[PDB]
């Protein structure tokens, strides 16, 4: 799985979550998103390939995934409580984080 595969996984599972009916479905999808986000975190994206590995952009890029992983964690806790709609609402709000990184680095 490269960065592009990780992004497919994140995108697909956000949709799985908003379509889901029960807490197990949401938990399973969030867990897949967590793995994909942790995987993507070490990647050098195409738009930063020509920058220093030690650049502020690469630092910030990696931190974008820390934010995303943190928020997935909080959503996963809601799903573990069986709070389907609250967990779905939290997953929906990950989109701001997806967008924030895309605006800078995609």
User: Closer to a copy of itself at the Cβ: 16 or 67?
Assistant: 67
Residue ranges that bind a copy of itself, judged by CB under 8 A: 35, 38, 42, 54, 56, 59-60, 63, 67, 70-71, 73-74, 77-78, 80-81, 83, 85-86, 89-90, 93, 96-97, 99-100, 103-104
Q: Which does 103 bind (CB under 5 to 8 A by kind): ligand HEM, a copy of itself, Ca ion, none?
A: a copy of itself
User: Closer to a copy of itself at the Cβ: 3 or 35?
Assistant: 35
Render 5-50 in DSSP notation, one character per residue: HHHHHHHHHHHHHHH--SHHHHHHHHHHHHHHHHHHTT---GGGTT
What is d(CA 66, CA 84) in angstroms, rounded to the nearest whole number? 24
User: Closer to ligand HEM at the Cβ: 19 or 102?
Assistant: 102
Show the tokens assigned to 97. Answer: 């984080």
- Sequence-distant (≥ 6) Cβ neighbours of residue 80 within 8 angstroms: 23, 27
What is d(CA 37, CA 33) in angstroms, rounded to the nearest whole number? 6
Interface residue list for Ca ion (CB under 5 A):
2, 5, 12, 19, 21, 70, 74
Binding residues: 7, 102
């Amino acid at each position: 799985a490269d960065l592009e595969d990780n992004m497919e996984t994140l995108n697909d599972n956000l949709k799985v979550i908003e379509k889901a009916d029960n807490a197990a479905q949401v938990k399973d999808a969030l867990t897949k998103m967590r793995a994909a986000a942790l995987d993507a975190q070490k990647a050098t994206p195409p738009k930063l390939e020509d920058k220093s590995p030690d650049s502020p952009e690469m630092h910030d890029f990696r931190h974008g995934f820390d934010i995303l992983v943190g928020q997935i964690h909080d959503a996963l806790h809601l799903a573990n409580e069986g709070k389907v709609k609250e967990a779905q609402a939290a997953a929906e709000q990950l989109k701001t984080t997806c967008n924030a990184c895309h605006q800078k680095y995609r």
